[PDB]
Write a protein that holds these residues in place. Structure first.
Motif, mmCIF file in Angstrom:
data_model
loop_
_atom_site.group_PDB
_atom_site.id
_atom_site.type_symbol
_atom_site.label_atom_id
_atom_site.label_comp_id
_atom_site.label_asym_id
_atom_site.label_seq_id
_atom_site.Cartn_x
_atom_site.Cartn_y
_atom_site.Cartn_z
ATOM 1 N N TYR A 174 26.968 -67.244 -47.372
ATOM 2 C CA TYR A 174 26.346 -68.138 -46.412
ATOM 3 C C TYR A 174 25.389 -67.320 -45.544
ATOM 4 C CZ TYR A 174 25.930 -71.538 -42.524
ATOM 5 O OH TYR A 174 25.487 -72.401 -41.549
ATOM 6 N N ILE A 175 24.087 -67.550 -45.731
ATOM 7 C CA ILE A 175 23.075 -66.738 -45.086
ATOM 8 C C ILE A 175 22.551 -67.569 -43.935
ATOM 9 C CG2 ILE A 175 20.902 -65.492 -45.333
ATOM 10 C CD1 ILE A 175 21.517 -65.279 -48.400
ATOM 11 N N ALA A 176 22.889 -67.123 -42.737
ATOM 12 C CA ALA A 176 22.745 -67.959 -41.536
ATOM 13 C C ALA A 176 22.699 -67.123 -40.285
ATOM 14 C CB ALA A 176 23.849 -68.979 -41.453
ATOM 15 N N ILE B 269 14.769 -64.690 -49.301
ATOM 16 C CA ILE B 269 15.239 -65.941 -48.690
ATOM 17 C C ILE B 269 14.209 -66.488 -47.687
ATOM 18 C CG2 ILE B 269 17.142 -67.156 -47.486
ATOM 19 C CD1 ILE B 269 18.052 -65.820 -50.153
ATOM 20 N N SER B 270 13.734 -67.710 -47.921
ATOM 21 C CA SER B 270 12.611 -68.254 -47.136
ATOM 22 C C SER B 270 13.018 -69.364 -46.153
ATOM 23 C CB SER B 270 11.499 -68.760 -48.061
ATOM 24 O OG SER B 270 11.960 -69.866 -48.828
ATOM 25 N N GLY B 271 14.227 -69.882 -46.318
ATOM 26 C CA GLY B 271 14.703 -70.960 -45.476
ATOM 27 C C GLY B 271 16.157 -70.727 -45.149
ATOM 28 N N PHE B 272 16.588 -71.240 -44.006
ATOM 29 C CA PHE B 272 17.977 -71.036 -43.545
ATOM 30 C C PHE B 272 18.464 -72.369 -43.025
ATOM 31 C CE2 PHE B 272 15.465 -67.312 -43.444
ATOM 32 C CZ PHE B 272 16.316 -66.272 -43.885
ATOM 33 N N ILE C 276 21.549 -71.087 -54.464
ATOM 34 C CA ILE C 276 22.077 -72.468 -54.480
ATOM 35 C C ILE C 276 21.199 -73.413 -53.654
ATOM 36 C CG2 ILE C 276 24.108 -73.995 -54.046
ATOM 37 C CD1 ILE C 276 24.557 -72.055 -56.390
ATOM 38 N N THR C 277 20.942 -73.070 -52.386
ATOM 39 C CA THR C 277 20.107 -73.903 -51.498
ATOM 40 C C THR C 277 19.399 -73.003 -50.509
ATOM 41 O OG1 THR C 277 20.103 -75.814 -49.895
ATOM 42 C CG2 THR C 277 21.935 -74.350 -49.750
ATOM 43 N N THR C 278 18.245 -73.429 -50.002
ATOM 44 C CA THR C 278 17.574 -72.637 -48.955
ATOM 45 C C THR C 278 17.194 -73.442 -47.727
ATOM 46 O OG1 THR C 278 15.380 -73.023 -49.842
ATOM 47 C CG2 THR C 278 16.515 -71.022 -50.546
ATOM 48 N N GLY C 279 18.127 -74.234 -47.220
ATOM 49 C CA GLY C 279 17.871 -75.148 -46.121
ATOM 50 C C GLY C 279 19.057 -76.076 -46.045
ATOM 51 N N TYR C 280 19.158 -76.814 -44.943
ATOM 52 C CA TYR C 280 20.204 -77.835 -44.792
ATOM 53 C C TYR C 280 20.123 -78.845 -45.944
ATOM 54 C CZ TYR C 280 22.585 -82.098 -43.168
ATOM 55 O OH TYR C 280 23.340 -83.250 -43.097
ATOM 56 N N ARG C 281 21.263 -79.152 -46.555
ATOM 57 C CA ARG C 281 21.348 -80.329 -47.454
ATOM 58 C C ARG C 281 22.723 -80.943 -47.207
ATOM 59 N NH1 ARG C 281 19.340 -79.532 -53.703
ATOM 60 N NH2 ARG C 281 19.098 -81.796 -53.402
ATOM 61 N N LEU D 8 25.372 -80.431 -52.287
ATOM 62 C CA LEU D 8 25.871 -79.078 -52.497
ATOM 63 C C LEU D 8 27.102 -79.066 -53.393
ATOM 64 C CD1 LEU D 8 25.155 -78.403 -48.919
ATOM 65 C CD2 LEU D 8 23.863 -77.321 -50.744
ATOM 66 N N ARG D 9 27.891 -80.138 -53.331
ATOM 67 C CA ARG D 9 28.971 -80.333 -54.318
ATOM 68 C C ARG D 9 28.409 -80.325 -55.744
ATOM 69 N NH1 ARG D 9 32.277 -84.780 -50.802
ATOM 70 N NH2 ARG D 9 33.672 -83.315 -49.714
ATOM 71 N N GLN D 10 27.342 -81.094 -55.970
ATOM 72 C CA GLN D 10 26.668 -81.102 -57.277
ATOM 73 C C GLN D 10 26.271 -79.685 -57.714
ATOM 74 O OE1 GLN D 10 22.630 -81.160 -58.140
ATOM 75 N NE2 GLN D 10 23.709 -80.467 -59.990
ATOM 76 N N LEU D 11 25.576 -78.978 -56.825
ATOM 77 C CA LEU D 11 25.017 -77.657 -57.139
ATOM 78 C C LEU D 11 26.133 -76.652 -57.445
ATOM 79 C CD1 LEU D 11 22.174 -77.689 -54.452
ATOM 80 C CD2 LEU D 11 22.009 -77.969 -56.965
ATOM 81 N N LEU D 12 27.130 -76.613 -56.576
ATOM 82 C CA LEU D 12 28.288 -75.728 -56.795
ATOM 83 C C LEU D 12 29.070 -76.092 -58.046
ATOM 84 C CD1 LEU D 12 29.350 -75.408 -53.074
ATOM 85 C CD2 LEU D 12 28.119 -73.659 -54.470
ATOM 86 N N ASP D 13 29.306 -77.391 -58.245
ATOM 87 C CA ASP D 13 30.038 -77.853 -59.420
ATOM 88 C C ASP D 13 29.357 -77.380 -60.710
ATOM 89 O OD1 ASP D 13 31.926 -79.100 -57.779
ATOM 90 O OD2 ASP D 13 31.208 -81.145 -58.172
ATOM 91 N N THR D 14 28.031 -77.534 -60.766
ATOM 92 C CA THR D 14 27.244 -77.150 -61.949
ATOM 93 C C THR D 14 27.261 -75.636 -62.146
ATOM 94 O OG1 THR D 14 25.844 -79.131 -61.833
ATOM 95 C CG2 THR D 14 24.906 -77.244 -62.993
ATOM 96 N N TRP D 15 27.112 -74.890 -61.055
ATOM 97 C CA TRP D 15 27.201 -73.427 -61.129
ATOM 98 C C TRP D 15 28.546 -73.010 -61.742
ATOM 99 C CZ3 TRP D 15 30.047 -69.191 -60.135
ATOM 100 C CH2 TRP D 15 29.436 -67.965 -60.470
ATOM 101 N N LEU D 16 29.654 -73.510 -61.188
ATOM 102 C CA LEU D 16 30.994 -73.182 -61.730
ATOM 103 C C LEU D 16 31.218 -73.634 -63.183
ATOM 104 C CD1 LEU D 16 32.852 -74.050 -58.423
ATOM 105 C CD2 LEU D 16 32.872 -71.702 -59.464
ATOM 106 N N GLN D 17 30.666 -74.790 -63.555
ATOM 107 C CA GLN D 17 30.738 -75.290 -64.942
ATOM 108 C C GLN D 17 29.968 -74.373 -65.899
ATOM 109 O OE1 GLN D 17 28.640 -79.014 -65.632
ATOM 110 N NE2 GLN D 17 28.988 -78.975 -67.850
ATOM 111 N N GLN D 18 28.771 -73.953 -65.487
ATOM 112 C CA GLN D 18 27.906 -73.103 -66.318
ATOM 113 C C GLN D 18 28.334 -71.642 -66.313
ATOM 114 O OE1 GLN D 18 24.149 -74.009 -64.457
ATOM 115 N NE2 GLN D 18 23.710 -75.703 -65.876
#
Length: 204
Positions: A7-9, A165-168, A182-187, A192-202
């Motif tokens: 978590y880059i923040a 990293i260009s967005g926080f 995974i993401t570079t800004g608030y979502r 983020l469930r989608q993105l993480l789920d796909t990362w772990l699946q792949q």
């Protein structure tokens, strides 16, 4: 060995405060599968009026989008110096003392700043927050003042830059030799469930 979700923040980034409930949920849901860690990512001149108005517009956006609280009355008074390094260093310090208290300490700083209007650039403020979390001042203050905490903090900033990293807030999975943005800004949590789920699946 679990993959690490960085978590880059920065505690003085308003969209990071908007995102605090989302990263809390992610930690709650994914911590059996990902180790979730913070990589925090400096000035001494007063905040200029135009820049202050930009920041306050961000606070309003965050508030109405996410419901996260801000105290707008007398926000960012003139003379205020927007130095984000000490709060980042406080977070790094707690990571060396009690890793389990890193996310709570980061959140404590954000609340103290956005709601409390506290000058979270000051040690006096930071050590009080650490005490509230069960970290004695006798452990926190030497670490905060150490060259080690300073150099680790700066190395973090440099790595964030190196990673492009260009967005926080930003989220990066690091697995072995590999890093995945995974993401570079608030979502919202659903995206983020989608993105993480796909990362772990792949990856696994």
């Amino acid at each position: 060995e679990k993959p690490v979700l960085w978590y880059i923040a920065d505690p003085m980034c308003s969209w990071c405060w908007g995102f605090a409930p989302v990263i809390e949920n992610i930690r709650q849901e994914y911590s059996a599968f990902l180790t979730v860690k913070i990589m925090p990512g400096g000035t001494n001149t007063p905040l200029l009026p135009e820049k202050r108005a930009q920041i306050l517009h961000h606070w309003h956006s965050v508030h109405i989008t996410t419901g996260q609280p801000f105290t707008f009355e007398n926000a960012l008074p003139e003379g205020f110096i927007y130095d984000t390094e000490p709060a980042c260093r406080g977070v790094v310090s707690v990571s060396l003392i009690e890793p389990e208290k890193v996310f709570p300490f980061f959140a404590a700083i954000q609340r103290a700043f956005y709601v409390g209007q506290e000058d979270v650039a000051q040690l006096a403020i930071l050590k009080k927050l650490a005490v509230d979390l069960g970290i004695p001042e006798s452990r926190f203050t030497p670490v905060f003042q150490s060259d080690e905490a300073k150099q680790r903090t700066l190395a973090g900033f440099q790595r964030v830059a190196q990673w492009g990293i260009s967005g926080f807030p930003a989220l990066v999975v690091e697995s072995g030799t590999d890093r995945y943005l995974i993401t570079t800004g608030y979502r919202p949590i659903e995206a983020l469930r989608q993105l993480l789920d796909t990362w772990l699946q792949q990856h696994g």
